[PDB]
Amino acid sequence: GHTSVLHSYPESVGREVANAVVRPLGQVLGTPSVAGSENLLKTDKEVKW
């Protein structure tokens, strides 16, 4: 179960995708604020992706 979907693709584009997709999540999680943005994910497909 530890296998990754992005493994088949080249490593450079894989790491580009990884950083580009995790940077906004890390920014949102850090520096908590009173305002509620309703997170970013809403449905099962989004959280699965």
Added chain:
Amino acid sequence: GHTSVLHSYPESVGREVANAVVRPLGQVLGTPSVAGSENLLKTDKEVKWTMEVICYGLTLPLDGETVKYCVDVYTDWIMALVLPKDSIPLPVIKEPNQYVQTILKHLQNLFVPRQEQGSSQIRLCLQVLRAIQKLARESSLMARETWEVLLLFLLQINDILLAPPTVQGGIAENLAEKLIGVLFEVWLLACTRCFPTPPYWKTAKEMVANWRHHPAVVEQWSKVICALTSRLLRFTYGPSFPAFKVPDEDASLIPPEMDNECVAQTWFRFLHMLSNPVDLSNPAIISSTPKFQEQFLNVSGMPQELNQYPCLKHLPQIFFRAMRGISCLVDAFLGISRPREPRPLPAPRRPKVNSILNLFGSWLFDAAFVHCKLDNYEAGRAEACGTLCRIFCSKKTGEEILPAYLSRFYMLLIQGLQINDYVCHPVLASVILNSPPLFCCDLKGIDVVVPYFISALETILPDRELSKFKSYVNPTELRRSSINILLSLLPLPHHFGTVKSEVVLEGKFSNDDSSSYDKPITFLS
């Protein structure tokens, strides 16, 4: 269902991840000279992830080759239905229907017009259109659900690219012909085998009524209905009946696999597919679509935008083209295959005049009278009784005609033949030219309109060169028709003499100024 999962993320990061995914995958699958390479997709989760990430890429602007790779891999993937390819992943071949349905759902976002990349957008759109066209033309066996999805996708993209008002230099102007042609071709192919359900017919009829301001729509409809009616009359009567002429390409639009019984239903449904062509005469009705109403909210400039839109200047030509098409259809039904140049004699196997009136005359009568009440759409009005005027003269001898049709035709003839102030040269010339044997066909009560014809001829025969009519019809042919009409009325006085002729005084219709309107005029005068 076409919304991409990646839309939640900000635009910049989404563009970056889409480009990063599409660069190697596109450069491998889309680019040629990649035979023998193992597929990068092996599992259903893999292919679903890839499909979603590629689907988000369409919304991105066409800058760079990312959109080119996306459309190329889409065209390669959709071609898997026609024939399997090495680059196609194995799970795609295993379950093709659902995957191609999802791809077609994703392709809807591509056709959305963009800001300034139309130079490449036109090429990409035509490539996708021809890819789908060849996909459906040589399609393998597939479930009717895929056909329904394809038809809905075509209707949706046509609605996206046609409903808004036409702006000069836009993509819609250059792509309307291709869109309508591919829509009609795919619809005919679907009716060949699937025969889509009545709800789809209703949806198409409702959607197509909003694209009547594009000149290509009426032309394509006319061509396809001419092909269908030629195919129908090819077997409705038999080889004895004259064959309707039709271009080879238009005859090739319909496939020969259709059985005789199925042709009638699709012919009727396509004949009524477009709304009443008389609607094109009214400019307010055309400029009342829901998109136009939404556009009317954005309308804040000239107050005459209800009748001065950029795309409302082509209405007279579109109406004339529709009237020409319906006139050609009526001529094919009647037996006058050639134009009007001599006109061949009507075939002995032609249907009764009342049936032709029931089938077509309602549209013809409405089109004639709507411009009778209205020099803007004169060509359509002239063609209207071109057709009508010609229909009645082809009646078989001793054939009964329903009196309502005769009354309507007589009213039309009275309205057309006016000289005082309500004179229109094209319709008058058409009425005179189209009906030489009008009086000779022993029409019941035709003698009532005799004084109007006498008054009309007094303003054409004494004229030397017919300057007013020389820009619409050939003066020599018009003179010949006038002579034929006059020569058929000379025996009437001496034959009748003192017999009174009824007068119909419903307003300022009579041309005489003798203050004897309430008096049946005898032929002696």
